[PDB]
Chains A and B, each alone.
Chain A
Amino acid sequence: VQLQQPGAELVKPGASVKLSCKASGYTFTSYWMHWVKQRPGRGLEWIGRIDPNSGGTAYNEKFKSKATLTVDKPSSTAYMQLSSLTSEDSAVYYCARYDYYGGSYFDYWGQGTTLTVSSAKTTPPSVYPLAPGSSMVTLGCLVKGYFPEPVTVTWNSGSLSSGVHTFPAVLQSDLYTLSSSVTVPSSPWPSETVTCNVAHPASSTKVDKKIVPR
């Protein structure tokens, strides 16, 4: 019993997609196939559900003409097709099974598919230095506007491996941007030069940036 569904897809705006969920396990008829959409920062949204046997379906009006639930009996697969995909559709999409009302639950969830509505074409990041304007000291590198994921930011050829934090990227302008801040002690800097190391293999880009005061 494992509800397998592919982990990711890329899709251009205005297009549509069909997310498949092949139910590896004990039954289909005995269970219901619901669909849920998790977007970082706004929990879960029930899209709807479909019955294996008949095909009949009920949805969340908010997706009334966005999703289209179907099911193929010969392959124990459940599909969901979103049409006219827009920037909001970008989300993690799951297919969980329902046990009758009888114990009444969503015992086994599919791992989700990370749909990505984006017109962006491969694009290299732009490294910008983040420096203090005044004991310890926080320096940084802004890795702005890059696609696709994911970027590799390191400090001093690996030498600074602490006082370092590289946060998650944020999506906007259909490009990702993130940052790495490094707390190197107030003595080293400005004294010892501090340099951040960014690489975006998706473009095969590699850049250096020495954090200078200003």
Chain B
Amino acid sequence: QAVVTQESALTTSPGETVTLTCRSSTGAVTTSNYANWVQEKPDHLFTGLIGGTNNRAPGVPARFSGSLIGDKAALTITGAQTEDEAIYFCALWYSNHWVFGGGTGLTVLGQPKSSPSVTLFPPSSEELETNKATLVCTITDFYPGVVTVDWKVDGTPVTQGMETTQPSKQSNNKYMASSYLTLTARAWERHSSYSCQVTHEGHTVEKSLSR
């Protein structure tokens, strides 16, 4: 019955200092919600760094440190390491229950920044005979690994029948993702304008195919 907020993503550099907040929609975070920051490494790895706001589980690199700033709980990685580029989930206690926030995807640039290469494919002709049309939009070599994807069928923004994988690290250390938009071959012949809009870092890139 409570929503715990966390930053979308944060980009810090090596040897730097970065800090994640953990907001409470019920009020300022108290010591009663022992925000327990937990780290997420890819392929389902989970370790808790900070517990009880202040205490650091034993064996957590001293650089990680918990505290309260203002009205929100806070994880402050001092001297951020390249091996810190990971997802950070915070948790808050509320008398009888616990509540995990949205988590922060933290990028620790260890390569310069790259833009997304967009490719929006049309339905295969073969697929069309199956009374199905799958718009395939691919996104490669973007870094940091965070993009927002939007479609617009006939200048109108689509709100359903669209799905996108979560950014997955490429061999280089950059990221890639693939967005799909499923349609009945009938729904396809009905519209004309199609576009895949990928925003990466606040810069949009469109790729459209007229039918």
Contact = CB atoms under 8 A, between A and B. Distances in A.
Contacts of B58: 107
Contacts of B168: 167-168
Interface of A: 34, 36, 38, 40-41, 43-46, 48-49, 58-61, 92, 94, 96, 99, 101-107, 109, 111-112, 126, 128-133, 138, 140, 142, 144, 165, 167-170, 172, 177-179, 181, 214
Contacts of B136: 130, 140, 142, 179
> Interface majority SS on B: helix, strand, loop or mixed?
strand
Interface in B96-124: 96-103, 117, 119, 121-122, 124
B100 A44 contact: yes
Contact of B89 (A41, A43, A59, A169): A43
A40 B166 CA distance: 8
A36 B40 CA distance: 13
Q: How large is the interface on B (under 10, 10 to 19, 20 to 34, 35 or more residues)?
A: 35 or more
Interface string B132-145: 00101010100000
A167 B140 CA distance: 10
A169 B57 CA distance: 36
B187 interface: no
B55 A46 contact: no
A152 to B, nearest CB: 17
B173 interface: no
A41 B166 contact: yes
Contacts of B1: 61
Interface stretch (B9-17, B74-82, B146-154, B175-183): B175-183
A181 B119 contact: yes
B124 A128 contact: yes
A116 to B, nearest CB: 15
A22 to B, nearest CB: 18
Nearest to B118: A138
